[PDB]
C-alpha cells in the first residue's frame, strides 16, 4: 500500500553533508539545488554551482551515498549547454522522444536534451519554453523578485494529443505560476501562465522551489503532491505541502506549517552530524524516471536537499551550501 504517504505526520532522518564543492580552481562556494534519479543502482545527480561570480551546473554519479563526495564532477559548461548563467535543474526522461530533458533557468525557462544520461558532454545548448521572453503576467507581478525554479510534470492521459504537460515557476514575490501544452506538442506551445497559488501578504510562505509529483496508484484527492519552500523563523527553510486530484486543480494544504512541515527542522532528526537548520531546494530521488514525475510510496522517499551551517555569514551567493539526504 502507500505506507509512506504520511498525511500530516511526515518524519525523516538526515545524513550529514554528503556533497561539497571541489577544491579546484573554480572556487565554488556552494553546491545547490539537486535533481536526481536512481537507475540500476547508480544515482545520477545534477546540481548547481554557486559563487559570487555566478551560477552554472554539474553532473555526477555514484552508487553509495557515503562515497558521493568523491564522485568526479562533470562541469556542464564543457558540454554545448555551455558557459553562462544556468541554475536549478530538474531531470526526467521524456519517453515519447527517447530523450532526457534537463529543465532549468537561464533568465527564462530553459531546457536541454540528451539521449544518454551517462554521457554528460552531450547536453544541448539551452532552448527556451517561452520564445518571446518573460510572460506578461510574470513581468506584471514579479515586483523586485526573480523568475526562477522551473518544474515540468505531465499527466498520464491515454491520448497524447490531449494529455497535458505543465510548467510551474516562481517569482520570489509570492506567486506560483503554471503553463501547459499537450504531450504531442511538448516542449513547444506552453501557454501564457496562470497564477495558481499566491501569498501576497507573506511572500516567504510561498517562496520558490516547487515540486509537483504524482503518487502512484492514487486515484482521488491525493493523486498529486505539491511541495513549496517557505522561509520561516530565523530564516530557516522548510517545505510546505498540498494535495490535489489533478495538476491544474484545487490544492488543499497537507502539512503546511513550520511546526508541522512536509520537511523542515521540526520533523527531521539528525541522527548523526547536525549541520543545517534549513531543508532547502530539494528533490525526491526518482526510480520512475519519466515525465509523469511519479513516486512509489510503497517505498521510503529519499529527498536530496541543500543545507548550510546556520552560522555562516557570507554574501548570499557565497553561502557554503552542501547537499544532504533525508529518508523516511
Numbering used by the authors: -7 to -1, 30 to 350
The study reports:
Arabinoxylan arabinofuranohydrolases belonging to the GH62 family specifically remove α-1,2- or α-1,3- linked L-arabinofuranose decorations from xylan (Kellett et al., 1990). For the GH62 enzymes of S. thermophilum sequences of Abf62A/Abf62B belongs to subfamily GH62_2, while Abf62C is a member of the GH62_1 subfamily. Abf62A and Abf62C are both active against these substrates but have no detectable activity against CM-linear 1,5-α-L-arabinan, which contains exclusively non-terminal 1,5-α-L-arabinofuranose linkages, indicating that these enzymes lack endo-arabinanase activity. 1HNMR spectroscopy showed that both Abf62C and Abf62A are active against both α-1,2 and α-1,3 L-arabinofuranosyl linkages in wheat arabinoxylan.
The crystal structures of Abf62C in apo form and in complex with xylotriose were determined to 1.23 Å and 1.48 Å resolutions respectively. The Abf62C apo structure was determined using a selenomethionine substituted protein crystal by the single wavelength anomalous diffraction (SAD) method, and it was then used as a search model to determine the structure of the Abf62C-xylotriose complex by the molecular replacement method. The Abf62C apo structure contains one polypeptide chain (residues 30 to 350) in the asymmetric unit. In addition, five phosphate ions and one glycerol molecule were modelled. Each ‘blade’ in this fold consists of either four (‘blade’ I, II, IV and III) or five (‘blade’ V) β-strands forming antiparallel β-sheets that are interconnected through loops of variable lengths to form a funnel-like structure that encircles the central cavity, which houses the active site. A comparative sequence analysis was undertaken to detect sequence conservation among various members of the two GH62 subfamilies, including structurally characterized representatives from the basidiomycete Ustilago maydis (UmAbf62A) and the ascomycete Podospora anserina (Siguier et al., 2014) points to three completely conserved residues Asp55, Asp171 and Glu230 as the catalytic triad of Abf62C. Interestingly, one of the phosphate molecules present in the Abf62C apo structure is bound in the active site cavity forming a network of hydrogen bonds with side chains of active site residues (Lys54, Arg259, His303 and Gln328) including that of the catalytic Glu230, thus suggesting the probable position of arabinose binding. Surprisingly, despite significant sequence similarity between PaAbf62C and Abf62C enzymes (64% identity) and also the conserved calcium binding residue (H285 in PaAbf62C and His303 in Abf62C), the Abf62C structure does not harbour a calcium ion in its active site.
